[PDB]
Amino acid sequence: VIDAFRLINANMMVLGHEPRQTTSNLGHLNKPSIQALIHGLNRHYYSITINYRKNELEQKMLLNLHKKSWMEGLTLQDYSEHCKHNESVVKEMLELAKNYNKAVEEEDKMTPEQLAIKNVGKQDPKRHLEEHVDVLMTSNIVQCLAAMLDTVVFK
Amino acid sequence: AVQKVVVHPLVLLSVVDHFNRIGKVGNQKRVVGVLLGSWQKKVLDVSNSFAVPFDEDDKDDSVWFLDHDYLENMYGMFKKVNARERIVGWYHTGPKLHKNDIAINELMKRYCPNSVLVIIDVKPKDLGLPTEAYISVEEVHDDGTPTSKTFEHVTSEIGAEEAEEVGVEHLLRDIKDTTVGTLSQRITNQVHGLKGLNSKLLDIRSYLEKVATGKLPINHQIIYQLQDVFNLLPDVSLQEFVKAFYLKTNDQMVVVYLASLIRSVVALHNLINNKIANRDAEKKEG
Amino acid sequence: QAAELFLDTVSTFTSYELMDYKTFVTYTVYVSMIALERPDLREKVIKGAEILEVLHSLPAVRQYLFSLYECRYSVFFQSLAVVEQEMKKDWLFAPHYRYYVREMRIHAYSQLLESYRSLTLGYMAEAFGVGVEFIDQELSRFIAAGRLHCKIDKVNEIVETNRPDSKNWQYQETIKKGDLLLNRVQKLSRVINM
Amino acid sequence: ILAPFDNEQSDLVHRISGDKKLEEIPKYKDLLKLFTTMELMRWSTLVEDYGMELRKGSLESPATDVFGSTEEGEKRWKDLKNRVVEHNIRIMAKYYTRITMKRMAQLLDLSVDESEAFLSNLVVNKTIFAKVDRLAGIINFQRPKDPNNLLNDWSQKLNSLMSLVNKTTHLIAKEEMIHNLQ
Amino acid sequence: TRPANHRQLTFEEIAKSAKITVNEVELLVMKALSVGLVKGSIDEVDKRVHMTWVQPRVLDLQQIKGMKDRLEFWCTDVKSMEMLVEHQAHDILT
């Protein structure tokens, strides 16, 4: 939120004129906020549009933000905790799957208008389930690819 | 001594500006300036800088001119508007470190004995980071001197503060990777890692040829560490390794199986819901 | 599931569906013979006096259980034959009265082969039932089924044992149940959407 | 010396060693130097080179305590015997992988039955791991291998290799910088 | 002297090459290990040893050529794998 302003002399409105004689559409492309307009604004000062001067070089070197070391790409994630994480997640998948079919059976026995309210107080199994599938697949794919690349690129 | 350094982006933009700003004044190949920052534990955090007038003539390796009192009183000026920052290093923008540089350090070390050297490459062609960090040490060896004086490597990374990160994120409107996730987890990684490793091996060969002939000032320490590196490579062919690798992948696949099954049945339920929500509504238009 | 839900031997009144509390005891001991293994057997159905006092009046079932526990295989088979004959004509056991039997027998074999490793088959004749060829064909047809992991050699009349890990078995049932569920879900997929 | 091995003894010996005045008595200096280092002579040379010096000088009164009283002397000699045989077992398990019964029995200068009876209470106290076989006279250490470990150490070796190959290049660059810059 | 593979070796071969009787080689290798110049392990019932690392040494302009060669036809594999992967997953993030 940046803005630019300049004063105007009350003389001009004593003549009954208005400042900023106008020849082009390009000044009117934005509207002031109500909060800015409660304060003086047009009855005392006027705003000017702004834009950002850029060049390619600084962009080309700024996007390096959060780039990382090549070696980081080839690490195998401690094969002993990996299986612990996996068959921790599977447990809550168990306890959720046993709670899914209740919400499948109640699919239609009540007015759908209040069905939204049926969500609000109590987490639903369906949406809350599939993020675990997302996690499991995303992890177990890359963990397996990296091992192959290693077992080829070194000796 | 010091274990890593974190650099804020504002110094990057400041240096990039300074380089062109001097390009106005003269045919200078290089520029130099002062780095301001702060400490926590073994970690250095660097955040602000200003340039100092500097001159050098390629006539010889021993004719250069850095101005004292400009730095002396400019640091006073900055102190008088933010007390938290202390002088903590200096930077220059040469593509590689120059022969003068150690004798440069012995000048400004008076201002902070821990002073560190940071290189900021102004013209990237490559996928490594632009920064480097070097600290001075004496090192002992059998003969030729009791100690040499040597720059040695400290690890460096770019960071960001709460609000400068908002500032930079406003500017990068023009490009982003489509989605973070497994395609970013790969393309942003493995290919880049492989390219880096290839470039490292290329530089090793480029030196090794200019040691088989050329100038060839043979240095035995290089050969020692290379012997270690070549000894370290494992034999993949061993049966007892193979049985383990299979016994692991043949386990990992089961989880992908189960997850894909669950995904399919959920999508099926979604289709059923859609179709019954259509056939019981389309009839209303008669 | 029966043996788990038949552990109500202290809360079963003289109900209107089983005229005899003793019939209830016989049913629960019959199912507990199959369901549970040696520690639980030795801990629950033999240490609970509420059924021991009842069994005191039922010599046949008492000796039937004791024969299996005490490894007196010679007397085991006559009792088993009597039991299966009785339950062939009984309700809610006839439709599979053979299945039950074919379990107990194989179970008996698994109760003897794991203590030793190179037992000759001749010992069975004077310890389990006379007839070398009978035991031979029985063991052959039980090995072929994929249970009772062991092996037999005829030139020297010897029986060896092996120790397969508890992974391959934990794999076949997974793969087959996956196959059947995939088939079912494919049928659901095509039966809907014309 | 009499204390059984533990971290407290293993660093207390380090603290008390290297005292300037201690050099005035080179005998006990050699004693703790012997017990600090690797595999040590079984039993003969130590008693032959130190079993008689415990009465000369002007400081042998604790030595007489180790000798004089019958019960105290016998107990402390037995404990020294146990300490040295334990040190031998610890170091050989540190270096060896699999060994025959008679070889180490000879290296302990005592019969095979005594050897196994002495190491049995060691292994049941969970201080040294061994699985001896009393049919072929072959004993070993070498704990069984778990799948998670093998490739884990493989990955560790990969990490070290990457770090070393990364560190080489900077040193190479600073080598070129001082010769071919001008 | 030996390759990096195949560097297991037997007691009697040491006994010959050091002209010391077999019964001493155990104490010799123990000594060698204890001063850290070589790292490995021993098998007394097979009478064999498995050395795994050895102190570096100086070596001359003829030996380094083998380093050059093995490095070149190592780097070729990295180049091949990069050119493979950046093709086979072209679509997933072109």
UniProtKB/Swiss-Prot annotation, chain A:
Keywords in alphabetical order: DNA damage, DNA repair, Hydrolase, Metal-binding, Metalloprotease, Phosphoprotein, Protease, Proteasome, Ubl conjugation pathway, Zinc
Q: Which GO cellular component term is one of those annotated? A: nucleoplasm
Q: Which sequence positions carry the modification called Phosphoserine?
A: S69
Q: Name one GO molecular function term.
A: proteasome binding
Q: Which GO terms describe its biological process?
A: double-strand break repair via homologous recombination; double-strand break repair via nonhomologous end joining; proteasome-mediated ubiquitin-dependent protein catabolic process; protein deubiquitination; protein K63-linked deubiquitination; regulation of proteasomal protein catabolic process; response to ethanol; ubiquitin-dependent protein catabolic process
Using the record's annotations, give every residue carrying the modification Phosphothreonine: T111
- Give the residue range of the signal peptide: none
User: E.C. number, please?
Assistant: 3.4.19.-
Q: Which class of enzymes does this protein belong to? A: hydrolase
| Expression by tissue | Widely expressed. Highest levels in heart and skeletal muscle.
Keyword Metal-binding attributed: yes
Q: What does this protein do?
A: Component of the 26S proteasome, a multiprotein complex involved in the ATP-dependent degradation of ubiquitinated proteins. This complex plays a key role in the maintenance of protein homeostasis by removing misfolded or damaged proteins, which could impair cellular functions, and by removing proteins whose functions are no longer required. Therefore, the proteasome participates in numerous cellular processes, including cell cycle progression, apoptosis, or DNA damage repair.
Q: Return the similarity comment.
A: Belongs to the peptidase M67A family. PSMD14 subfamily.
Q: Please identify the protein, giving its name as recorded.
A: 26S proteasome non-ATPase regulatory subunit 14
- Source organism of this protein record: Homo sapiens (Human)
Swiss-Prot record, chain B:
Cite the InterPro entries for this sequence: EIF3F/CSN6-like_C, JAMM/MPN+_dom, MPN, MPN_RPN7_8
Q: Record's Pfam families?
A: JAB, MitMem_reg
Give the sites modified to N6-acetyllysine: K200, K210
UniProt entry keywords in alphabetical sequence: Acetylation, Isopeptide bond, Proteasome, Ubl conjugation
Q: Which GO terms describe its molecular function?
A: protein homodimerization activity
Task: Tell me which residues make up the MPN domain.
Answer: 5-140
Sites of the Glycyl lysine isopeptide (Lys-Gly) (interchain with G-Cter in ubiquitin) crosslink: K176
Output a single Gene Ontology CC term carried by this record: nucleoplasm
One GO term under biological process is: proteasome-mediated ubiquitin-dependent protein catabolic process
Q: Cite the SMART domains for this sequence.
A: JAB_MPN (SM00232)
**Any additional notes?**
Does not bind a metal ion.
Quaternary structure, from the entry: Component of the 19S proteasome regulatory particle complex. The 26S proteasome consists of a 20S core particle (CP) and two 19S regulatory subunits (RP). The regulatory particle is made of a lid composed of 9 subunits including PSMD7, a base containing 6 ATPases and few additional components. Within the complex, PSMD7 interacts with subunit PSMD4 through their respective MPN domain. Interacts with TRIM5.
Family the UniProt entry places it in: Belongs to the peptidase M67A family.
**What's this chain's function?**
Component of the 26S proteasome, a multiprotein complex involved in the ATP-dependent degradation of ubiquitinated proteins. This complex plays a key role in the maintenance of protein homeostasis by removing misfolded or damaged proteins, which could impair cellular functions, and by removing proteins whose functions are no longer required. Therefore, the proteasome participates in numerous cellular processes, including cell cycle progression, apoptosis, or DNA damage repair.
Curated annotation (Swiss-Prot), chain C:
Superkingdom: Eukaryota
Q: Which residues form a coiled coil?
A: none
Specify the PCI domain's residue ranges: 1-166
Q: Which family does it belong to?
A: Belongs to the proteasome subunit S10 family.
Function text? Component of the 26S proteasome, a multiprotein complex involved in the ATP-dependent degradation of ubiquitinated proteins. This complex plays a key role in the maintenance of protein homeostasis by removing misfolded or damaged proteins, which could impair cellular functions, and by removing proteins whose functions are no longer required. Therefore, the proteasome participates in numerous cellular processes, including cell cycle progression, apoptosis, or DNA damage repair.
Q: How does it assemble?
A: Component of the 19S proteasome regulatory particle complex. The 26S proteasome consists of a 20S core particle (CP) and two 19S regulatory subunits (RP). The regulatory particle is made of a lid composed of 9 subunits including PSMD6, a base containing 6 ATPases and few additional components.
Q: What is this protein called?
A: 26S proteasome non-ATPase regulatory subunit 6
Lineage of the species this protein comes from:
Eukaryota, Metazoa, Chordata, Craniata, Vertebrata
Please give the range of the full-length protein represented by this chain: 196 to 389 of 389
UniProtKB/Swiss-Prot annotation, chain E:
Instruction: Spell out the family assignment given in the record's similarity comment.
Output: Belongs to the proteasome subunit S11 family.
Q: What is the lineage of its organism?
A: Eukaryota, Metazoa, Chordata, Craniata, Vertebrata
Q: What is this protein called?
A: 26S proteasome non-ATPase regulatory subunit 13
Main function? Component of the 26S proteasome, a multiprotein complex involved in the ATP-dependent degradation of ubiquitinated proteins. This complex plays a key role in the maintenance of protein homeostasis by removing misfolded or damaged proteins, which could impair cellular functions, and by removing proteins whose functions are no longer required. Therefore, the proteasome participates in numerous cellular processes, including cell cycle progression, apoptosis, or DNA damage repair.
| Residue(s) carrying N6-acetyllysine | K16
Top-rank taxon: Eukaryota
Q: How does it assemble?
A: Component of the 19S proteasome regulatory particle complex. The 26S proteasome consists of a 20S core particle (CP) and two 19S regulatory subunits (RP). The regulatory particle is made of a lid composed of 9 subunits including PSMD13, a base containing 6 ATPases and few additional components.
